[PDB]
Paper text:
From these four complexes, the photosystem II ([name]) complex catalyses light-driven water oxidation and provides the electrons used for carbon fixation. [name] is a homodimer with a molecular mass of ~500 kDa, each monomer contains cofactors such as chlorophylls (Chls), quinones, carotenoids, and lipids which are coordinated by at least 20 protein subunits. The eukaryotic reaction centre is a dimer surrounded by tightly bound monomeric light-harvesting complexes (LHCs) and trimeric LHCII complexes. In this work, [name] was isolated from the halotolerant green alga [name].
A high-resolution (2.43 Å) structure of [name] shows structural properties of the Dunaliella [name] supercomplex. The C2S2COMP structure is similar to the previously determined C2S2 supercomplex from Chlamydomonas reinhardtii or higher plants and the cyanobacterial core structures. More than 1700 water molecules were detected in the C2S2COMP model, the first detailed water molecules structure for a eukaryotic [name]. Overall, water molecules are clearly excluded from the membrane space in the [name] core, in contrast, the region occupied by LHC’s shows a relatively high number of water molecules in the membrane region. Two additional densities, unique to C2S2COMP, were observed close to [name]-Ser84 and CP47-Cys218 in the stromal interface between [name], CP47, and [name] and within 10 Å of each other. These were modelled as post-translational modifications (PTMs) – Ser84 appears to be phosphorylated and Cys218 seems to be sulfinylated. CP47-Cys218 is positioned on the outer edge of [name], close to the stromal end of the thylakoid membrane, and thus is susceptible to oxidation by H2O2. Moreover, CP29COMP contained only 9 Chls, compared to 11 in CP29STR and 13 Chl in Chlamydomonas [name] [name] (Sheng et al.). The average distances between [name] Chls 603, 607, and 609 to the CP47 Chls 607 and 616, increased from 17 Å to 20 Å between the compact to stretched conformations, suggesting faster transfer rates from [name] to CP47 in the compact conformation. Altogether, transfer from LHCII to the [name] core should be considerably slower in the compact orientation from both distance and Chl occupancy considerations.
Residue numbers in the entry:
A (entry chain a): 9 to 344
B (entry chain m): 3 to 33
C (entry chain i): 1 to 35
D (entry chain v): 2 to 33
E (entry chain d): 304 to 352
F (entry chain t): 1 to 30
G (entry chain z): 1 to 61
H (entry chain w): 60 to 103
The structure:
């Protein structure tokens, strides 16, 4: 009666009757993510200050050391460690491991494994339910972005101290120093990413507003219009023809999406491909390819520099650059 | 501040929570 | 520290082996499809 | 210049080659 | 806490320093009506950068 | 004191998440 | 010998352009391949001959 | 030295195995899972 | 620089690397010519 | 390890092992010490390796003692490659001078309780007088932070704001030790060295040392503690 | 060609229409290989036509000439170019071979047989024919092993390849006694990928490279014979999916991994990617700046051993976490960098003080200054330096170009692997077109998810 | 803004991957007719998956 131990374990792992699906991607996802969650919560609450720049000048990061929710962060690994893979057993003591930024590498490595296995688990459940498999492909874009900011940029820069700090103000610090060193605003891949998030907001609002506009009357005014939809109803709950007609009369009767499947494919593909592009932009600026440098591009007949908005941005970036890591630079060029 | 922010946070939690709990409990009693 | 490393190596090896032999356990047959 | 002129001639030739093949296959029978 | 403790640093304090740098190095060219001609010695900077 | 408030708010949010996941209203096929 | 090589390479460029424009046309023409066998083979043969000739004349130029 | 540490960092260490007991526990765990899967095959 | 006997063909050398970019556009041209059948 | 077999190994097989932070050990030789040719010698390849850090501390009940710490930094506390001259007399009197080298190492230890104590383990400009079994002396302990070091608010000695500028009405008369001045006045430390092993074929000398030095003052701030460093030392003569 | 009505595939998926057409698929493949060889030849001819002899290759935006120079053609001691005719011959040979490959591809695409299974049973295949699939895989493994052995033959008997680690600043060297030790060779494949280990990117000598290539060639030939003479075992037949899309997805995952690895080789390795041809790496440039500012202040009389910075660590020299004497500043993160101009200065404890005081060579100083001024930092409109530098110099490192392009290619091919692996599983299971609407699985499942 | 981009991507992917078959052919975009009175994707299956 299929009494085998491994068979029973496998049937439980791949069971679609569990409240949360596990799967074989989940048997890697759940322990790594639980490890990352535990260490992140403990470190965010009570971690000692971390010498992020490797200059024996630690940064507090945790609530018990005087941070609020906004300023609290898990501080990246010491610059003295660089990319050298610092786990707990490679430290002489837990105090040294905490001082040198070990929790950051632990959380980042486990989070990377967990999100890769989360994408695999999305594929696995889609397969076990008889679905088409490309929700994992859609989720690959935030996975790419997280990998770029936590792993790929430290790889290209030579130090996990250049990873994005696990925090809010730390995220802002990462963004500001990134613009200072790479001019990410002038990077076309970042422009595509901004277009993707703005367009995703626009298209989410547009699609939701059209579907809500063409909702068929099934309820009364004293009842919420959502009550007009029943879970598992066979018929359509809104007028696709009326919504498409309004959209065509609104902008152009052509250049529309009267095919609902084509419309939803567009909604899927636009922010996903743009987030792919901006994650690749972060990954390329990891290897110092940078945004458009238009400093002193416009000169007059006599050669006098006519400053532009790019030059004003350059002045801002100079202010950003001469102030970040105020004690960490011994030489003029910021090559490292 | 240390204590006026404390009472502001406590009131901002409890009063809307009370409102939501009133409405939810009457709804759930009405199934 | 070496005890911790041994334990973590055992844990990671256990979960990775579960992953590997789980996808080795006739996984393309685990679908509701026909044929 | 002669270099720019020859580069433009080569560019126009290579750009027009493929479209000319498609046009010739359109007007000369088909199977495209 | 930062004013009464020179060893207390957060990413928030780092961002405050970065904002000060932005304002100081941006103002002279960004607000010409201010007629700001600040000598280099008064510009907030870091070591060797 | 403030760390108490921050930790309380975070764990209360996580408790709301836990309850919304595991004690949600079950969607009905009817 | 340099001028001979340059003339041979110019002819090779012309034959290459003729092959690029004609071989797909002959292939996708209706019964064009079964009729232009001699022309296509002559073009390919003269192309190979010009390539070998340029390679030989490089050692003398 | 003032304290003890494993000093396994760098040095190009195979699977990070600085002590042969690590390779043995890796082999033992993998082989135990394989043996369970193997004596438990042809059971589906 | 190219060898001296091949120097006059530098202008046509300078155009060649874009031809692989031209091939995918040619595929789109062919698909348009068959009306994206 | 002896210095000869240390030089017999390559950088690839020393890298990552920690041996680069370890002083050479005189495995050969004798412990008579006084069986050394007196004269003027060029101290060369002076090296110092701590084996213990202890911090002077005061508890609630009124007891002062040197407590044990946890070394927060990694193997970066070694001093090596220092140069100098030393004078040995027939009676056993010795004078000891260190000229220059890697004579400073920034170190941080953690007290029981989570407090960070950064200090500059240094032996620079060390004048030491005594005998062959023990000679005591003084060395200069520079400031931990250079004058151009900036605090998290940008204030510093030779560079910075000199006041808390995030407070438009609070930088005066109360944070004078925080903003009005950032003091970088140097300090002094005491050391006692003791020769243990010697080999007169090569002139290598070795032994133990015990030093007491102030910790960081945080640029004219919270007062320094006394760090007691015991350890080994090695060197070559002429 | 075919339409959507007879194939079920729209024009934007029209290549899927030739999944089951062996001859047309072969034609597409051969035309594509012609395209690759065309780009190789055309780009090589472009680079040699734009090559300027006095400037180094990395200042000229060249990525293929460094490859041929690393193979050891036309260069001498110090990476100095002696002749560009080998590069011209490489470009010409590729460009001519691309014509033959393009003719074959166009022929098999247009007028070749659509399916090879009837008249050419040696070349005919179906995707479920696992024996024929392993036969084709074995042929290609034999070809790849012969290519690796071609590299070995070039290294041993046909002029050698460029050794950047040769004394005096590198030269073209004959590799005698390659490292054939299995422990040394497979240690690289079992190394950690992190700092100080670097996995296979940290290979630092031509002996190791050529010995590994001997191993790869022999293993590829042996596995090719193995796959010609074997059929996949039942465990493999149960584990895998046997279709063209599944095989494509496996190859997509493999080449995504290869693209990421090539990115890391270009960014970090200076042995297989000599800095004479590719410019300094990022770590190389940072360490070169540190070395240059050390030697300048040494020439100004300052003691670079007792000088400490604002933090107190040391402006020129400090210690790695394992105790090695390293360059100070942020380039401490690059303390594990190894380069031909700095390794003569390193004793067992790291940067030797007396060597840094007395044994600095003029060629080392010149390379350090050059690599400091040509760091792999620049904008995508090719303005050299950090983002705040003005438009003065025109430089982006070939290492930067290669690393950025190949990370992008590796990522997209990972995504394509995900797409095709999912679609292969769904198509094998029979629901790649959607839910059946009459036998929906979830409706047959117990509720509460 | 970021949640709206997330919602757009996730909803498009969910609809495109929970589609009903509704016609032979590997191009699913031809399986939708605008004048139809039934859903083109399984809300039940999408809900179960998420
Ligand atoms: C466990 C597996 C973890 C792998 C990922 C984490 C580590 C990646 C990494 O640290 O990468 C770096 C390593 C290379 O490491 C470097 O290797 C270098 C080797 O150079 C050495 O050797 C050279 C030889 O000349 C030189 O001498 C040089 O000076 C010398 O230092 C150095 O050791 C560096 O310290 C070291 O950091 O790459 C490699 O090992 C090659 C492997 C490819 C890595 C590609 C990264 C992106 C991968 C997936 C992205 C997924 C995207 C899709 C989802 C989203
Ligand atoms: C080894 C490479 C490889 C192979 C042989 C194929 C083969 C196949 N794929 Mg593809 N694919 C791959 C890689 C591969 N793919 C990768 C890398 C991705 C992107 C992440 C995908 C994504 C994918 C999708 C989404 C789909 C296919 C499909 C198909 C089939 C039809 C293809 C077609 O007609 O396109 C015709 C060609 C085009 C329409 C041209 C597209 C225009 C591109 C985007 C231009 C990009 C140029 C740009 C400048 C390059 C640089 C970008 C960046 C690196 C900087 C075919 C069997 C289809 C399928 O499943 O059918 C069964 C399908 O819908 N594939
Ligand atoms: C790397 C590029 C590449 C390759 C090699 C192919 C290959 C193939 N495609 Mg195509 N295709 C491509 C990309 C590519 N495609 C992309 C980017 C798209 C999106 C638009 C598609 C979408 C697509 C569709 C929609 C279909 C194919 C099909 C075909 C096959 C039949 C060809 C045919 O009948 O065309 C006929 C074309 C012509 C007659 C005009 C072009 C003539 C030649 C090829 C031009 C070459 C010029 C060249 C310089 C000459 C060299 C000469 C030599 C001596 C040097 C062919 C094997 C078809 C298929 O599956 O067949 C069953 C099909 O229906 N393709
Ligand atoms: C592995 C790929 C690779 C690499 C690393 C390089 C690297 C190099 N090339 Mg090369 N090249 C390549 C492929 C590559 N190339 C290809 C495929 C061609 C054919 C076009 C050429 C032809 C070429 C020429 C003709 C020239 C170079 C030059 C250069 C140098 C400067 C490049 C530059 O300014 O880029 C500028 C940056 C870009 C162009 C950005 C590209 C953005 C991507 C590709 C588009 C992304 C798609 C879009 C955003 C989204 C739409 C998706 C879809 C709808 C299409 C650099 C050393 C120059 C040089 O110095 O040579 C001596 C030179 O003049 N190359
Ligand atoms: C637009 C497409 C594009 C472009 C133009 C290139 C271009 C480049 N890639 Mg590539 N790449 C791409 C797509 C692309 N890539 C994609 C889609 C992937 C997967 C994500 C990769 C994966 C990749 C890898 C893995 C590598 C390259 C690398 C390279 C560079 C050298 C390629 C080389 O040497 O070929 C190699 C040619 C062959 C394998 C064909 C066989 C050649 C034979 C074996 C050579 C024999 C030589 C012999 C010893 C000579 C002596 C003969 C006799 C005396 C014995 C080149 C700049 C390499 C590089 O420079 O790293 C950064 C590298 O390692 N690429
Ligand atoms: C292009 C390379 C290539 C390809 C794609 C194949 C493909 C195949 N091989 Mg393989 N193989 C090849 C090269 C290749 N091989 C060569 C070079 C050899 C000689 C060493 C062999 C010898 C060989 C054997 C002896 C067998 C196969 C078999 C197989 C099949 C299943 C393998 C499997 O489960 O993968 C998964 C493989 C693994 C999990 C092993 C990985 C080994 C460790 C993890 C590597 C550690 C380093 C890594 C970077 C981490 C598959 C059809 C099997 C078969 O059915 O044969 C009839 C089998 O028994 N292979
Ligand atoms: C997306 C992800 C995939 C994309 C790209 C992957 C890139 C490269 C992949 C190859 C990297 C190098 C391979 C060898 C790795 C290695 O030996 O690690 C060995 C390293 C080395 O381990 C360390 O070594 C140090 C010395 O170098 C010290 O000794 C440390 O004490 C020791 O821990 O250990 C690890 O990094 C842990 C790896 C465990 C991986 C488990 C997750 C795998 C999940 C699924 C895999 C399924 C099959
Ligand atoms: C730039 C790099 C290009 C990569 C583009 C990736 C395209 C898919 C993005 C992720 C979509 C997320 C799921 C959303 C999803 O499932 O998409 C839905 C749709 C699936 O339609 P079909 O399954 O009918 O078509 C795909 C194959 O089955 C053959 O048609 O996907 C496509 O249309 C692919 C065509 C894109 C052609 C290039 C553009
Ligand atoms: C750090 C140390 C670990 C080194 C890591 C690398 C070790 C070498 C692993 C290479 C395995 C090659 C793939 C064989 C087929 C895999 C799928 C399978 O299995 O398919 C299954 C297949 C179905 O029949 O089996 C078969 O064909 C027979 C397959 C043979 C399985 C190999 C087992 C070797 C011995 C295992 C340990 C001794 C185990 C005893 C432990 C018991 C408790 C102490
Ligand atoms: C299938 C198909 C397709 C594809 C196609 C292809 C891909 C083709 C190709 C092809 C190829 C890939 C070709 C190539 C070629 C080459 C040639 C034609 C050549 C040549 C020669 C010459 C003449 C040269 C000369 C010279 C020299 C020798 C050196 C100096 C300079 C010069 C340049 C003068 C498409 C997509 C469209 C569509 C669908 C169908
Ligand atoms: C040349 C060279 C060299 C050498 C190298 C080598 C020797 C390499 C190799 C290698 C190898 C030897 C590799 C291998 C591998 C493997 C892999 C990569 C894998 C895999 C697989 C998978 C992914 C699987 C999956 C699965 C599972 C898990 C279960 C279920 C089913 C299946 C099967 C799906 C050196 C560095 C020295 C030097 C330089 C150069
Ligand atoms: O950590 Mn974050 O910011 Ca990239 O540059 Mn170098 O390191 Mn640091 O300085 Mn600049
Ligand atoms: Cl900062
Ligand atoms: Cl620096
Ligand atoms: Na600074």
């Amino acid at each position: 009666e299929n009494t085998s131990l491994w068979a029973r374990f496998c049937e439980w792992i791949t069971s679609t009757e569990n409240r949360l699906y596990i799967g074989w991607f989940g048997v890697i996802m759940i322990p790594t993510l639980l490890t990352a969650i535990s260490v992140y919560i403990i470190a965010f609450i009570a971690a000692p200050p971390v010498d992020i720049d490797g200059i024996r000048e630690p940064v507090s990061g945790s609530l018990l050391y005087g941070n609020n929710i906004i300023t609290g962060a898990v501080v990246p690994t010491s610059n003295a460690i660089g990319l050298h893979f610092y786990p707990i057993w490679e430290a002489a003591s837990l105090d040294e491991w905490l001082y040198n930024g070990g929790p950051y590498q632990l959380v980042v490595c486990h989070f990377f494994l967990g999100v890769c296995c989360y994408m695999g688990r999305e594929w696995e459940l889609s397969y076990r339910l008889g679905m088409r498999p490309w929700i994992a492909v859609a989720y690959s874009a935030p996975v790419a972005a997280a990998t770029a900011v936590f792993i790929i940029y430290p790889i290209g820069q030579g130090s996990f101290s250049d990873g994005m700090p696990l925090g809010i103000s730390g995220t802002f610090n990462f963004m500001i120093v990134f613009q200072a060193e790479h001019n990410i605003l002038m990077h076309p891949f970042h422009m595509f990413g901004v277009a993707g998030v703005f367009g995703g907001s626009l298209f989410s609002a547009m699609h939701g507003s059209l579907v809500t506009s063409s909702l068929i009357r099934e309820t009364t005014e004293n009842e919420s219009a959502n009550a007009g939809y029943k879970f598992g109803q066979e018929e359509e709950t809104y007028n696709i023809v009326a919504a498409h007609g309004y959209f065509g009369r609104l902008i152009f009767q052509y250049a529309s999406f009267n095919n609902s499947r084509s419309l939803h494919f567009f909604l899927a593909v636009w922010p996903v491909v743009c987030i792919w592009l901006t994650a690749l932009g972060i990954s390329t600026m990891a290897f110092n390819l940078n945004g458009f440098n238009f400093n002193q591009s416009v000169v007059d007949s006599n050669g006098r520099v006519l400053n532009t908005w790019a030059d004003i941005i350059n002045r801002a970036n100079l202010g950003m650059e001469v102030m970040h890591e105020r004690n960490a630079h011994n030489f003029p060029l910021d090559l490292a | 501040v240390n204590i006026l922010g404390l009472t502001a946070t406590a009131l901002f939690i409890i009063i809307p929570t009370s409102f939501l709990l009133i409405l939810y409990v009457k709804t759930a009693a009405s199934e | 520290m070496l005890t911790l490393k041994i334990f973590v190596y055992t844990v990671v090896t256990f979960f990775v082996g579960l992953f590997i032999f789980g996808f080795l356990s006739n996984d393309p047959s685990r679908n509701p499809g026909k044929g | 210049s002669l270099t720019l002129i020859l580069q433009l001639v080569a560019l126009f030739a290579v750009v027009a080659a493929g479209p000319l093949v498609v046009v010739l296959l359109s007007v000369r029978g088909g199977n495209l | 806490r930062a004013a009464e403790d020179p060893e207390f640093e957060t990413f928030y304090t780092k961002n405050i320093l970065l904002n000060e740098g932005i304002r100081a190095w941006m103002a002279a060219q960004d607000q010409p009506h201010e007629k700001l001609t600040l000598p280099e010695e008064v510009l907030p900077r870091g070591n060797a950068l | 004191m403030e760390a108490l408030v921050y930790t309380f708010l975070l764990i209360g949010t996580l408790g709301i998440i836990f309850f919304s996941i595991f004690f949600r209203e079950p969607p009905r096929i009817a | 010998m340099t001028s001979i090589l340059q003339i041979a390479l110019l002819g090779l460029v012309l034959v290459s352009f003729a092959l690029v424009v004609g071989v797909p046309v002959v292939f996708a023409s209706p019964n064009g391949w079964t009729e232009n066998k001699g022309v296509v083979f002559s073009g390919l043969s003269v192309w190979f001959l010009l390539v070998f000739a340029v390679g030989v004349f490089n050692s003398f130029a | 030295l003032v304290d003890d540490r494993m000093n396994g960092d760098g040095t190009g260490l195979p699977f990070g195995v600085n002590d042969g007991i690590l390779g043995w526990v890796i082999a033992g765990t993998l082989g135990t899972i394989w043996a369970i899967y193997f004596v438990s095959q042809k059971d589906l | 620089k190219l060898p001296e006997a091949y120097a006059p063909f530098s202008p046509i050398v300078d155009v060649l690397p874009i031809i692989p970019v031209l091939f995918i556009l040619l595929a789109f041209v062919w698909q348009a010519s068959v009306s994206f059948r | 390890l002896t210095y000869d077999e240390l030089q017999g190994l390559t950088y690839l097989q020393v890298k990552g092992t920690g041996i680069a932070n370890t002083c050479p050990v005189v495995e050969q030789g004798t412990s008579n010490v006084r069986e050394l040719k007196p004269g003027d010698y060029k101290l060369e390849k002076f090296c110092m390796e701590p084996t213990s850090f202890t911090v002077k501390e005061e508890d609630a009940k009124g007891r002062e003692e040197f407590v044990k710490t946890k070394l927060l930094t990694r193997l970066t506390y070694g001093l090596d490659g220092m140069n100098g001259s030393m004078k040995i007399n027939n009676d056993g009197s010795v004078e000891f001078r260190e000229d220059e080298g890697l004579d400073y190492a920034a170190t941080t230890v953690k007290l029981p309780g989570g407090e960070y104590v950064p200090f500059l383990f240094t032996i620079k400009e060390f004048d030491g007088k005594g005998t062959l079994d023990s000679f005591s002396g003084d060395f200069l302990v520079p400031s931990y932070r250079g004058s151009t070091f900036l605090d998290p608010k940008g204030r510093g000695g030779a560079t910075g704001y000199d006041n808390a500028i995030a407070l438009p009405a609070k930088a005066d008369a109360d944070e004078i030790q925080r903003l009005n001045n950032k003091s970088y006045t140097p300090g002094k430390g005491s050391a006692v060295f003791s020769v243990a092993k010697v080999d007169t074929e090569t002139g290598e000398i070795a032994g133990v040392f015990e030093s007491i030095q102030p910790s960081d003052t945080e640029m004219g701030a919270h007062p320094a503690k006394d760090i007691k460093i015991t350890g080994l030392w090695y060197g070559q003569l002429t | 060609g075919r339409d959507q009505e007879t194939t079920g595939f729209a024009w934007w998926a029209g290549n899927a229409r030739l999944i089951n057409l062996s001859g047309k698929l072969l034609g597409a493949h051969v035309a594509h290989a012609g395209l690759i060889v065309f780009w190789a030849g055309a780009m090589n001819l472009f680079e040699v036509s734009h090559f300027v002899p006095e400037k180094p290759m990395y200042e000229q935006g060249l990525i293929l000439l460094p490859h041929i120079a690393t193979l050891g053609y036309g260069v001498g001691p110090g990476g100095e170019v002696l002749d560009t005719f080998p590069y011209f011959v490489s470009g010409v040979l590729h460009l001519i071979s691309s014509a033959v490959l393009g003719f074959g591809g166009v022929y098999h695409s247009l007028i070749g047989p659509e399916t090879l299974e009837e008249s050419y049973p040696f070349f005919g295949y179906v995707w479920k024919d696992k024996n024929k699939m392993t036969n084709i895989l074995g042929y290609h493994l034999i070809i790849l092993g012969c290519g690796a052995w071609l590299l070995v033959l070039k290294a041993l008997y046909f002029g050698g390849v460029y050794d950047t680690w040769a004394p005096g600043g590198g030269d073209v060297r004959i590799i005698s006694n390659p490292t054939t030790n299995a422990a040394i060779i497979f240690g690289y494949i079992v190394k950690s990928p992190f700092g100080g280990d670097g996995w296979i990117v940290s290979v630092d000598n031509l002996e190791d490279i050529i010995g590994g290539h001997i191993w790869i060639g022999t293993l590829c030939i042996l596995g090719g014979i193995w796959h010609i003479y074997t059929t996949p075992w039942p465990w493999a037949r149960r584990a895998f999916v046997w279709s063209g899309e599944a095989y494509l997805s496996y190859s997509l995952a493999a080449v995504s991994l290869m693209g990421f690895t090539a990115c890391c080789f270009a960014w970090f390795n200076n042995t297989a990617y000599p800095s004479e041809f590719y410019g300094p790496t990022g770590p190389e440039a940072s360490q070169a700046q540190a070395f240059t500012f050390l030697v300048r202040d040494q020439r100004l009389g300052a003691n670079v051993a007792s000088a400490q910075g604002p933090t107190g660590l040391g402006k020129y020299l400090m210690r790695s976490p394992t105790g090695e004497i390293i360059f100070g500043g942020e380039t401490m993160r690059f303390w594990d960098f190894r380069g031909p101009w700095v390794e003569p200065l390193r004793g067992p404890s790291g940067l030797d003080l007396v060597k840094l005081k007395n044994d600095i060579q003029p060629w080392q100083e010149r390379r350090a200054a050059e690599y400091m001024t040509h760091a792999p930092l620049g904008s995508l409109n090719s303005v050299g330096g950090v983002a705040t530098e003005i438009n003065a110099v025109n430089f982006v490192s070939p290492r930067s170009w290669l690393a950025t392009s190949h990370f992008c290619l590796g990522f997209f091919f990972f995504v394509g692997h995900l797409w095709h692996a999912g679609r292969a599983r769904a198509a094998a299971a029979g629901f790649e077109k959607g839910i059946d609407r009459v036998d929906e699985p979830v409706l047959s499942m117990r509720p509460l998810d | 803004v970021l949640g709206a981009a997330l919602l757009c991507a996730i909803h498009g992917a969910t609809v495109e991957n929970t589609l009903f078959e509704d016609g032979d052919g590997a191009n699913t975009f031809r399986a939708f007719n605008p004048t139809q009175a039934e859903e083109t994707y399984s809300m039940v299956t999408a809900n179960r998956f998420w």
